[PDB]
Amino acid sequence: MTRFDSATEVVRVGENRYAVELDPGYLIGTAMNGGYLMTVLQRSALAESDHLHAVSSSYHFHRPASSGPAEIETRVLKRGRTVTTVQTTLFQEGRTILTGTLATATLDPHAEPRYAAPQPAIPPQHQCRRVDPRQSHLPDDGFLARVDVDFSPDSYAALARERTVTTPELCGYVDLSARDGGSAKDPLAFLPLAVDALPPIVSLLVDWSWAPTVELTWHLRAIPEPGPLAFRSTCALVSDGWFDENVDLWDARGRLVAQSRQLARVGR
Amino acid sequence: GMVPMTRFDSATEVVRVGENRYAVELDPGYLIGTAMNGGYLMTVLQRSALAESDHLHAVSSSYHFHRPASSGPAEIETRVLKRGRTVTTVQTTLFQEGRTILTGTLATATLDPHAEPRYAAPQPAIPPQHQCRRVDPDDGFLARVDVDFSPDSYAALARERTVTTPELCGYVDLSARDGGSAKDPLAFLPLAVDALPPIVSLLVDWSWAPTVELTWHLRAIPEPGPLAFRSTCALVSDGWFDENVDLWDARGRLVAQSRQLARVGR
Ligand SMILES: [Cl-]
Ligand SMILES: [Cl-]
Ligand SMILES: [Cl-]
Ligand SMILES: [Cl-]
């Protein structure tokens, strides 16, 4: 087992009802990381579905969650031969935290694209640079110790402020941490965390290092084989406190597997 | 003279029939075959959502399309999920003939009309509207909008060009035929993001291309007038494609970012 496998398990407690334990190791401060809460909700949805994969998932974040127990309430909105859509909502201390709606279907793992834009040039993982997480009061050194994130030299330079930031862009490789048990066993389970496992892109543009997510929708495009994911994060506009963070993930083979866009407002 | 209001203004109004309950008439003029255009269905849901909100604007709207709608009456059911000082989130579902058509969840907030970007990537180069081309010809959806394509985009659609990267750009607006430019562009954005030819047309022949999910974000209050657009797509595989539409207003300000995931087949 990897820490993630244990941390993200959801137990069926009743019909359309699940129980989960939020692992404080995924705290980014006083709130749980959003991607971790997505991972748990994704599990609830596929448990209720006749299809294997979460092909489009839209999540609306209402309030921060903390460690300990949380409860999940699911609802199938539409069942179909190709697409089955499930609504899943997370509760904690009598309050709604987050709601997701997921279009589930079963993708062909050997499907050949009819068209595919090339993966943008990203340096090999060995030429990339990682920042060793220092110790933290957060349980087991909090969120930053749950994932290994390798940045291209330019991305590192950007985050470390040792270079000019003309256009906001980060890239490199991401995976579950070596510390917690190595690469994800089930990549698909990890994608919802992966899309939200990187430094907020806004940190490169205004002087806020984070924002609570308001909305994130992400799409599964191909079935990835296990291993670290190549990532690229961009932003087209910061205005009236609002910013867009666009994260794409590719696999070892250069196959686009995830396209994510979240919207968040600074100072909330 | 001119009509004091557009077809769109009448066609997309919603009546409150009870608590968290609205009635709406789907205008057959917005049909693409037997199924109502998705953006028109979004416009109507957005109205119901804002009617239930203490905030003015639909900042993030995520929509899941369960089944196609036909013309005639439909009923809308709303639900406030979260109320806040900055954000209020409203769920809204559309029903027709006892069946769930579409469900949207909208993060609503009030954006500052005078707010200026702290950062902005550049609008892509798009020829002016006068150098663009409109298809010369249909009492359905294509007559509800006026869509001008860059010469290269027109050439691509007309198959007069070798397409490499699937891209379309130009200007879009409510049609002259229907009363001219949108009088409330904020109400028109949910239709605009889904008012273009499917991007997958450039890559494959297709007989059906239904939207599965669309999420779009409102980035600035647009000034009235035709919207500059750009539509792109990164992968068409296993019968699915992504359609990414960005919209800018007359002053080159980014106002909408849309991504939909859709099926494609023959
Ligand atoms: Cl925090
Ligand atoms: Cl059903
Ligand atoms: Cl079906
Ligand atoms: Cl509330």
Beta carbons within 10 angstroms of residue B136's beta carbon: 4
- HEC string for chain B: CCCCCCHHHHHCCCEEEECCEEEEEECHHHEECCEECHHHHHHHHHHHHHHCCCCCEEEEEEEEECCCCCCEEEEEEEEEEECCCCCEEEEEEEEECCEEEEEEEEEEECCCCCCCCCEECCCCCCCCHHHCEECCCCCCHHHCEEEEECHHHHHHHCCCCCCCCCEEEEEEEECCCCCCCCCCHHHHHHHHCCCCCCHHHHCCCCCECCEEEEEEEECCCCCCCCEEEEEECCEEECCEEEEEEEEECCCCCEEEEEEEEEECEC
Give B 42-71 residues with CB within 8 A of chain A: 59-60, 62, 64, 66-67
Q: Out of A78, A215, A238, name the one closest to residue B62 (CB).
A: A215
Residue type, A124: P
Kindly determine whether residue A99 and residue B105, on different chains, have CB atoms separated by under 8 Å.
yes
Method in brief: X-ray
CB-CB under 8 Å, B259 with A219: yes
- Would an 8 Å CB–CB cutoff place B165 in contact with chain A? yes
Task: Note whether B123 contacts A: Cβ–Cβ < 8 A.
Answer: no
Q: Which CATH number applies to A2-268?
A: 2.40.160.210
Query: Quick check: B60 and A101 CB within 8 A?
Result: no
Q: After which residues is chain B broken (C to N over 2.5 A)?
A: 137
| A47: phi then psi, degrees, rounded to nearest 5 | -65, -30
Q: In this structure, which topology does domain B1-266 adopt according to CATH?
A: Porin (2.40.160)
The conformation of residue A50, written as its DSSP 8-state character, comes to S
Breaks in chain A at C–N > 2.5 Å: after which residues?
none
Minimum-distance CB partner of B118 among A108, A238, A265 = A238
Q: Do B60 and A215 touch (CB under 8 A)?
A: yes
Q: Which residues of A touch B165 (CB under 8 A)?
A: 117
3-state secondary structure at position A38: helix
> Which ligand is located closest to the Cα atom of residue A77?
2
CB of B219 less than 8 A from some CB of A: yes
Chains A and B form CB pairs within 8 A to the count of 158
The H or E element containing residue A103 is strand A95-105
What phi and psi, each to the nearest 5 degrees, are found at residue A142?
50, -165
The closest ligand to the CA of B88 turns out to be: 4
CB contact A113 to B (< 8 Å): yes
Distance from CA of A268 to the nearest CA of B (A): 8
Distance CA B230, CA A61 (A): 29
Domain borders along chain B are: 1-266
H or E stretch including A6? helix A3-7
B5 CA: distance to closest CA in chain A (Å): 31
